[PDB]
């Protein structure tokens, strides 16, 4: 799609804006076990580099000598790498939060101080008398909300991957 | 800004889809008192109409007789109305959830059945011995993440309002 690649630049920009927004939203203090996408700090640099790539693709659209043509291919390749990584980690963390956890990555020190007596990955009270209690309903709401965050991030990352794959297939 | 009206429509429809995603994200069952922005279903029709307006601004871009030129002004005016409305609901609901509740609107029947024994607007335990307990930390995390969603939705609505106000400034 070489017709309005400028619009795809704005697509990448908006995707970076929402990626950094979701990254900031993920670090709300909840449990000492942060999501696997949070401790790796993927959303921050992912959105920053998405913004960089969109700015590069939607700045001049002319035949620059070295500053743009030479760097466009490497930025696009890095974008594909980052997008496939984001997809992989998102669909891995979905199973991590829905199925039994198989990596236990600790949260950041400054965010875990506020809520150090809480966990979110597993919550089945040792006392079955609390099954119909707000203590478990709150954790269920936390898990559902986090899964929604993961799903929206995953679908947006997949769309970004498709768009940048189209950009690369345009530029051999 | 008349140089790139095609990309402005893409930005508008991206903002609309982000609003739709946030609205669907806020429908997770948490407390019988749903946020004021959800019980009125503002994100649904608002986002759909942002889609429509942005698509209209970035479909033809030619001198159409009646389909495009005549409807563009009314679509933009409706966009400004909905954007200022969304700003008003966001500013109201932030103080609703963070300071005190002054408009109490119940959640939908089909979503409140899953979690009917839980509340998030005023969660201060009646027994002070539970202050340092996960039962309050869970609600604190719920409130913090809801406030974050409200803030990001507010900033997206404000940016979209600015963009569409500039568009109306272009088209007297």
């Amino acid at each position, epitope marked *: 799609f070489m017709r309005e690649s400028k619009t795809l630049g704005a697509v990448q920009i908006m995707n970076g804006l929402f990626h950094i927004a979701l990254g900031g939203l993920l670090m709300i203090p909840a449990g*000492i076990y942060a999501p696997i996408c949070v401790t790796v700090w993927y959303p921050l640099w992912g959105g920053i580099m998405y913004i960089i790539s969109g700015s590069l693709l939607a700045a001049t659209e002319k035949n620059s000598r070295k500053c743009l043509v030479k760097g466009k291919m490497i930025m696009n390749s890095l974008s594909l790498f980052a997008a496939i990584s984001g997809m992989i980690l998102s669909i891995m963390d979905i199973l991590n939060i829905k199925i*039994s956890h198989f990596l236990k990555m600790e949260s950041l020190n400054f965010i*875990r101080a506020h809520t*150090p*007596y809480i*966990n979110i990955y*597993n*919550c*089945e*009270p*040792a*006392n*079955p*008398s609390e*099954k*119909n209690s707000p203590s478990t309903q709150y954790c269920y709401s936390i898990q559902s909300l986090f899964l929604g965050i993961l799903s929206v991030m995953l679908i947006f990352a997949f769309f970004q991957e498709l768009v940048i794959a189209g950009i690369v297939e345009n530029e051999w | 800004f008349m140089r790139e009206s095609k990309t402005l429509g893409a930005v508008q429809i991206m903002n609309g889809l982000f609003h739709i995603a946030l609205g669907g994200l806020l429908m997770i069952p948490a407390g019988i008192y749903a946020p004021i922005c959800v019980t009125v279903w503002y994100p649904l029709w608002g986002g759909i109409m942002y889609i429509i307006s942005g698509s209209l601004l970035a479909a033809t871009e030619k001198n159409s007789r009646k389909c495009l030129v005549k409807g563009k002004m009314i679509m933009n005016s409706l966009s400004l109305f909905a954007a200022i409305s969304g700003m008003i609901l966001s500013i109201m609901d932030i103080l609703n959830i963070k300071i005190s509740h002054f408009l109490k609107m119940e959640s939908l029947n089909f979503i409140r059945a899953h979690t009917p024994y839980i509340n998030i607007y005023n969660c201060e335990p009646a027994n002070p*011995s*539970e202050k*340092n*307990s*996960p039962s309050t930390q869970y609600c604190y995390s719920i409130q913090s993440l809801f406030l974050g969603i409200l803030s990001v939705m507010l900033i997206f609505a404000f940016f979209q309002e600015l963009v569409i106000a500039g568009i109306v400034e272009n088209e007297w």
Partner: antibody
Amino acid sequence: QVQLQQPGAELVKPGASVKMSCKASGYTFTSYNMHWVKQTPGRGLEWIGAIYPGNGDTSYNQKFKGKATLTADKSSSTAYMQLSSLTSEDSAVYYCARSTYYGGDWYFNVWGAGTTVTVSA
Amino acid sequence: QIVLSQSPAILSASPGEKVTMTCRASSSVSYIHWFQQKPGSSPKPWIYATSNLASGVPVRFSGSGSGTSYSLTISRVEAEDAATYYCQQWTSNPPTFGGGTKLEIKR
């Protein structure tokens, strides 16, 4: 006056099934929980699960989720723990201790005598 | 699952002398519980809520500590306390007991 009564001990052949008993008296059997623990000298004392006689709900752990099952009845005010697939490495002491929300968190008010199971042919 | 480790595994304390044992955890548990057991007997509860004392306890014992580190303090240890002390928590499912400090009389 609150106390929990448990049988002394019994012998179980490997691969068989055994049922535990823990009779409660002096307090409401329905209201309080029926936590069970297992103590082994080699690896210390570890949790095995719990059962609520009020609603019949049971909770376990992923380590021994299917090894043991819990079933209690409010008619006799007794809780029954059934073990499946006995193994020679399952020769330890099983305790029956109730749990109460005392002092601001869950606390084991009283314990039981415990059964010293033996798995040998 | 939260693992609890306490050191030393075995310590010897002279009668009528202050002795302190520590129980650290891999996570900041909200509260800690201390239990002691005697040979051929069930582990009787000893300390609850990290600051209070169970019924039938000598006044000498006094548990304290906050955060990820908790310690047990004995004003005057005697031969009557020749048992093993267990560290227990209730923050995360499932609760995990400690290793055990076997008190020894050093005369």
